[PDB]
Structure 1
Amino acid sequence: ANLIKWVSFISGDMAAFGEWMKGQFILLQIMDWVLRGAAQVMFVNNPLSGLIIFAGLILQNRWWALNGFVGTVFATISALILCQNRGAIAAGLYGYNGILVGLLMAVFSNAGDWYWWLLLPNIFMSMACPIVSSALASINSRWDLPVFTLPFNILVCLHMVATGHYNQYFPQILIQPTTSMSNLTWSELDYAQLFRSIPVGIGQVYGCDNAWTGGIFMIALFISSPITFAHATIGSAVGMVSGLALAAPFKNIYMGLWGYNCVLACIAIGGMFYALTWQTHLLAVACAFFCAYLGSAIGNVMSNFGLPACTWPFCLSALTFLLITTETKFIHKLPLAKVAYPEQNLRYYWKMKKEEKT
């Protein structure tokens, strides 16, 4: 029983911890919001999971973790100075874009490790994450649709294309479009790495190509909500099978470059923003297949500009599947105000169902 209580306390949103947090020093609240935003990249509103995510990021590369921390803290500060909202900043909804911006600006920088000047764009871009997010909200809230990772996409694409591979101050890695045909010898497929694509794929959401970091992220997801963990591994599996189907190079599948978009899409559609149902689960799997496929599409499109498909496919596929109108009630699109971790969304669906029956 002590265990049940404790698990209840560490699982979900940790609402009790949030209400306790609403009282202490503003700096400790900022730390809680930073951790919560770090965790919200995978649709998790949990501080302990955020600490676990930061442990994984530190495990992979310290410099990337430092940039991510700077990005999330300055995105939260910018949300505060712009008086965006409390309960959105407090829930970490203004921090995940910042941590992603920091991490993926560190990842794609050709300058090297511990290029301190890289903090200056990271300070800037993170502080622009709320602004753009608010803007997109004013467009998306008309359809009750989430902003998703759109600010990150827009801002990191701006950074990597305005800077490019050839600027003297903030170089980026060289991304070139495919020019020669690559032969895939199916006899050279390594099933060990092919199945490591699931942990690496779930870890690549945050820029990490390490299997252990992916396992740490899965542990965080499981502590938060098992439904998110299941949909995450299913999304990475559909991403790796879709990559196999579209003649993608095996190294890309091994490095999880075909999974992060799919894990995000499967988490979002399957439970997070649609009420969980077998119809909704099938819709989530279909959206994850579409997300991998459109991920290949966007990667090939944006390789011409020297950019990568960072999360664009997730945003596009999730919004497309979240906009569809259906004449069956079993595909229920939850209102944004009533969106929380998928288990609580399912409990809400049940309450609505019973009440309607009566």
Structure 2
Amino acid sequence: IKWVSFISGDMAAFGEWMKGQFILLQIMDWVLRGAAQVMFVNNPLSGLIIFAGLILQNRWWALNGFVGTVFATISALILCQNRGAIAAGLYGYNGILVGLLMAVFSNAGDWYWWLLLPNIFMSMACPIVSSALASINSRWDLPVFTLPFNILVCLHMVATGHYNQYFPQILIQPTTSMSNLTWSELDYAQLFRSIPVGIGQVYGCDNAWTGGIFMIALFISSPITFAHATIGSAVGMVSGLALAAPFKNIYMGLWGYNCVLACIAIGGMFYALTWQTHLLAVACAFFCAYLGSAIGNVMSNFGLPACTWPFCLSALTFLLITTETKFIHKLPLAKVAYPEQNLRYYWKMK
């Protein structure tokens, strides 16, 4: 009971205890804590679970993610960006995403040690871009989200491109052939297995076991996040079916990571939870899937993956709408927390 409360939420007691210890242990929390905040979680335990899932899939990707997030945190410190924001991990999840997605899309092969240096440089530059986006987005009271990650990875990726001698990348070509979609060949087992692999694809992992581990991590923190995550993956696969995407893309979960993230964000994290806000989250996740198709097709010309760009665009657009009803209530950015605490704050204010 008490222990379950302790391991839930943002882990506040652990937070004070870690305050006392040496700078080195702390940097570990701040990196474990920021590892799991891609999915809007401030739980170090869940972050360790996320890391375990990364190790399970591929050791090289996990090592790159770890080094990227640790160097993003170190860069946030050296720049004196903020304390209490770095300590909550707001500067590390961009770094881990940059490292992981640089390791995923690199054609140089596994254990290519020279990949660390661009990884280091991109991850260190993440706090700079995060502060730059925070300066712009603070006028409208909007969060940075995953935009630094997108900007930095897209740079490495286009800069170098597939035809590079030192840091080659994977081929991304625009579609130029009519993909006949034999509906009788659809497999329902993989179609429903697209739910865990879809949530696992947030970090580039396409292993159903890693997706299940990520779902376990989300459930440990807050069941509401888990529910919105699984419903986001479901609407992502449904939209992929509706837009005649190849069945392999749906099975791999390429249509689900933007939707799961967008449903987590709008439904419980930044909008106070309500049935109206729940349908807003579902509509936002559908629009995020459809815009994800659009973005993936647009970015294919340059030779780049869609990444988390659709999620940012949809989440910002929804987070910006103004309404004449009191049910859809945007929370002030200073008082945003895990969705249960946000609902508690909404109840206390009302």
Cα deviation per residue 1:160-195 (whole Å; 9 max; x = unaligned)? Answer: 100000000000100000001100000000101001
Give the superposition deviation at 1:110. Answer: 0.3
Give the superposition deviation at 1:304. Answer: 0.2
Distance in 2 of aligned mates of 1:154 and 1:175? 18
Match of 2:143 among 120, 142, 146: 146
Cα deviation per residue 1:118-151 (whole Å; 9 max; x = unaligned)? Answer: 0001100000000000000000010000000000
- 1:215 is matched with 212
Give the superposition deviation at 1:87. Answer: 1.2
Distance in 1 of aligned mates of 2:310 and 2:223? 24
Distance in 2 of aligned mates of 1:184 and 1:142? 46
Give the superposition deviation at 1:261. Answer: 0.2
- 1:80 is matched with 77
Distance in 2 of aligned mates of 1:298 and 1:337? 31
Distance in 2 of aligned mates of 1:211 and 1:157? 27
Cα deviation per residue 1:269-290 (whole Å; 9 max; x = unaligned)? Answer: 0010000000000000000000
> What SS is found at the alignment partner of 1:270?
helix
- 2:104 is matched with 107
Distance in 1 of aligned mates of 2:119 and 2:15? 28
Unaligned runs of 5+ in 1: 353-358
Cα deviation per residue 1:66-91 (whole Å; 9 max; x = unaligned)? Answer: 00000000000000000001111000
> What SS is found at the alignment partner of 2:41?
coil
Distance in 1 of aligned mates of 2:44 and 2:290? 33
> What SS is found at the alignment partner of 1:272?
helix
Distance in 1 of aligned mates of 2:118 and 2:54? 20
Give the superposition deviation at 1:297. Answer: 0.3
Distance in 2 of aligned mates of 1:207 and 1:129? 19
Give the superposition deviation at 1:97. Answer: 0.2
Give the superposition deviation at 1:236. Answer: 0.2
Distance in 1 of aligned mates of 2:256 and 2:85? 28
Distance in 2 of aligned mates of 1:171 and 1:42? 29
Give the superposition deviation at 1:238. Answer: 0.2
Unaligned runs of 5+ in 2: none
Give the superposition deviation at 1:200. Answer: 0.2
- 1:63 is matched with 60
Distance in 2 of aligned mates of 1:166 and 1:36? 37
Alignment root-mean-square deviation, CA: 0.4
Cα deviation per residue 1:205-262 (whole Å; 9 max; x = unaligned)? Answer: 0000000000000000000000000000000000000000000000000000000000
> What SS is found at the alignment partner of 2:129?
helix
- Give identity over the alignment, percent: 100
Distance in 1 of aligned mates of 2:311 and 2:300? 17
Distance in 1 of aligned mates of 2:119 and 2:338? 29
Distance in 1 of aligned mates of 2:85 and 2:257? 24
Cα deviation per residue 1:29-52 (whole Å; 9 max; x = unaligned)? Answer: 000000011000111110000000
Cα deviation per residue 1:299-342 (whole Å; 9 max; x = unaligned)? Answer: 00000000011000000000000000000010010001000100
